[PDB]
Amino acid sequence: XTXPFXX
Amino acid sequence: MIGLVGKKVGMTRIFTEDGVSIPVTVIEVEANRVTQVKDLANDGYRAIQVTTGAKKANRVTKPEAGHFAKAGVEAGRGLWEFRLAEGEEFTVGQSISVELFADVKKVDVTGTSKGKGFAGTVKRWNFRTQDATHGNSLSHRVPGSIGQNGKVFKGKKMAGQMGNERVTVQSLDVVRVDAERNLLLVKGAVPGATGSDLIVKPAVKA
RNA sequence: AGGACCGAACCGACUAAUGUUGAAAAAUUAGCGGAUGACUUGUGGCUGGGGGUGAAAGGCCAAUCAAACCGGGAGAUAGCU
RNA sequence: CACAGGUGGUCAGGUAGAGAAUACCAAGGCGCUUGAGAGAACUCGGGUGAAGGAACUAGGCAAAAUGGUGCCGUAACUUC
RNA sequence: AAUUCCUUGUCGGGUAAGUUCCGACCUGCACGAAUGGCGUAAUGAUGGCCAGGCUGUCUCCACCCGAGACUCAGUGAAAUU
RNA sequence: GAUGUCGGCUCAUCACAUCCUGGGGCUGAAGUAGGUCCCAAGGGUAUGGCUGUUCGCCAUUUAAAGUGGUACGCGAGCUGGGUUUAGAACGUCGUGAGACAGUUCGGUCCCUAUCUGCCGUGGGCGCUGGAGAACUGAGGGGGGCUGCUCCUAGUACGAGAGGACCGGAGUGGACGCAUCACUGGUGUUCGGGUUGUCAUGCCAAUGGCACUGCCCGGUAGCUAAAUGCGGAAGAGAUAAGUGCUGAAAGCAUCUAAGCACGAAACUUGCCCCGAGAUGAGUUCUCCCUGACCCUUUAAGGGUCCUGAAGGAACGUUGAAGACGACGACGUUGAUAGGCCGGGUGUGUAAGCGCAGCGAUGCGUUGAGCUAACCGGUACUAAUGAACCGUGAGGCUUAACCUU
Ligand SMILES: CC1=C\[C@@H](O)C[C@@H](F)Cc2nc(co2)C(=O)N2CCC[C@@H]2C(=O)O[C@H]([C@H](C)COC(=O)Nc2cc3ccccc3cn2)[C@H](C)/C=C/C(=O)NC\C=C\1
């Protein structure tokens, strides 16, 4: 959700 | 022409009158004795098998003894071969001295390189180390990419054994020949460590 | 004198690295900030879910929050897999 | 979890020190419930470095450096 | 311009070279006066830029001390399929 | 019911529509230097400023700073500036919530590699009696870059200015291999200085701890910045291209017959691996020359005797090494350690004495200590044995013995 997995 | 087998004693410096220092590698080329002469009728090629040094009688096996007894020569620490230049002729038991290199003026030395063991890509292939900072995570001295988006080609420069292999350095200058001491001084560094065996042959490049 | 200064305890959490089936379901190490105050902390008490509280971020309300959890309506409905 | 975490209060030695910092010690209590050996790549945590010295890089990230007491001395600007 | 699309605007300064930065010009695509305008000493783990010093950040890595990796004995997982 | 992304870093690989180097044709090619086209992919092919950038501009170099493909190569390899969440403002649109390929500050990149593949390294069996060594080289990799200066020659050329091909020599850059004699780095296993503190009863002398406590030096080893070598010449067959002779076509014509030149490409030449080259090779040497039995009688089975050459294991070990492996040695012995001597490094120990109120200084003294180095030395450990491995090595055919 946060951009790249899992930022 | 044919060469000779010797031992690496070490390196030193030779001083000239004009004020020059020559890095030399001392090589002890003792009397090399022939143990077998090969021809085209029985072997298919012309060559000689020589030995040098000495060995323990209590440690030399009977198969090797019979090979030395047939030539009427004492056992040595090994056996090497050299090809003949279509005009050379030798005989079993003939002892060759370092005087053979009295007028060659250049030789190509061959030896077993020192052993580095398991080496990396920076040491073995001079790869460029990545950034030690700026975010690098466990990838400081790693190779990086090894292919594309599906196999690693053969001969890929990777880590592995480095050294302990046959290496030959070419076009070395002969600085001095002392048959009274069974020595040979060649300008420059040769492969291998002190106490290793060296194969010395005239320079083939010429 | 001081929401004053440097700086331990104490309270915080700016950077980096490590760790990321971790020692740890948010920490460790090296530094960093405040450190008589709008400070911090112990014990107990009050505010209850379209409500509370909020120096406000849609933040917190028992590792869960653009409407907590438990049970029930309930085998909700699902023209979709 | 026999978990590098968290948990309020009281007692507060010696040398150096401004100090409950820090270092080494006392009383006292521990060596952290797998070890032995070898001494490769690579990783982690550190030490040093020829000449050059930010050319690195998104960016001086990180690291290095500065670091105390006393005397002298101290600019622009200023709400003095 | 924390606001400028055109645009790295133009001039100057700084650099051997500066799409950033500083100072002027206004041609303000699309500033503007308490959803405040222009300045402002001081403060800031704030944002951008230039210097001195400093350094393995880099040119280009080299060696060393330790914890793992490696071997032996004991105990003995995991995602996945 | 998931194929993660611009650029950068690292690592690359292929193509040729070739940037440089090489070989040629035409030229409005005098020469120098260029223009265009053909052959050619062997090798080589910038650092920096600004910007997240690729790109681009600029500065300064270079023989040249090539064009493209490889998921606009490469995030189970790194990065996260950009893109691409939640926070917060400016401008702008909207009554507003909020929004904008507009801007601005800030903002978690996980995975212990099963298979394939690749880099390295071993075990097993096989190669037809077994074993110990040296080789042949089928084949496969590595390497293949280039500038400047001088001579040739200020000659050829050219009105001058200016300025060569061919050929030769020397010296460099980049890359690569090896090496540690030199110059140096490292040297927490050497020596010394020194701060605080504790202890060894105390003085003196030492030691522990404080990043090796902080520092100055420094052996061996490793090592580069250090110093030696290397790219080739040559050969064969060729590309574009140039040709000789020569007909079809009475001439002409490089070609159809025939013949000769021709490049960093190609095949060799140099370096390395290499007979698992199951097509398993060659050569030299060494070892074993028993007695029986059973039997669906054969490349048969079993027993007693025998145990070779040689190997393995064990042990001391290595400038060999992750483990295996490889190398050396094992009392008929210098393999390791220790010991002796030397060297090296540190820099004049301790104790005593002397001068000084003392801190200190001087003499004994270039003393003492001294790791991995050098040359020696059986003091210690490397034990005698045992184990594995056998007992003459198939059938057919041919030629020889008995050409
Ligand atoms: C990796 C993956 C699945 C793989 O199996 C398969 C993938 F690899 C395939 C693929 N993906 C992409 C391209 O191809 C891709 O764009 N993304 C993968 C990483 C995140 C990013 C993404 O989606 O980011 C958007 C972001 C707003 C997109 O912004 C746009 O403006 N998108 C856009 C532009 C258009 C333009 C024209 C017409 C239509 C358009 C539609 N959309 C946000 C952050 C979403 C993130 C998310 O869901 N992450 C999960 C990851 C999934």
Angle at B94 between CA B193 and CA B105, to 5 degrees: 55
B150 Cα: distance to centroid of ligand 1 (angstroms): 25
Strand F within 7 Å of which CB atoms in A 1-7? 1-7
What are the C-alpha distances in Å from B184 to residues B24, B29, B87, B141? 9, 7, 25, 42
Distance B147 CA to ligand 1 centre (A): 26
Range of the domain at B130: 1-206
Three-state secondary structure readout of chain B: CCCEEEEEEEEEEEECCCCCEEEEEEEECCCEEEEEEECCCCCCCCEEEEECCCCCCCCCCHHHHHHHHHHCCCCCCCCEEEECCCCCCCCCCCEECHHHHCCCCEEEEEEECCEEEEECHHHHCCCCCCCCCCCCCCCCCCCCCCCCCCCCCCCCCCCEEEECCEEEEEEEEEEEEECCCCEEEEECCCCCCCCCEEEEEECCCC
Q: Cα–Cα distance between B9 and B176 in angstroms, integer?
A: 15
Structural domains in chain B (count): 1
Q: Answer yes or no: is B103 CB < 7 A from strand D.
A: no
User: Does residue B101 contact residue B4 with C-beta atoms inside 8 Å?
Assistant: yes
Å separating the CA of residue B190 from the C1' of nucleotide F380? 39
Q: Residue B149 C-alpha to ligand 1 middle, in angstroms?
A: 20
In one letter, which amino acid is B164?
N
Residues 153-192 of B with CB under 7 A from strand E: none
Say whether the CB atom of B132 is under 7 angstroms from strand E.
Answer: yes
Which chain B residues in 170-199 sit with Cβ < 7 A of strand F?
A: 170-173, 187-195
Nearest to B123 by CA among B162, B156, B150: B162
Show which positions of strand F are touched by protein (CB under 7 A).
4-5, 9-13, 70-75, 77-80, 83-86, 107-110, 116-121, 131-137, 141-142, 175-182, 222-223, 227-232, 270-273, 282-287, 309-311, 319-322, 329-332, 374
Token couple for B57:
């009688």
CA distance to B29, B113, B120, B151, B165, per residue, from B160 (Å): 34, 15, 7, 19, 13
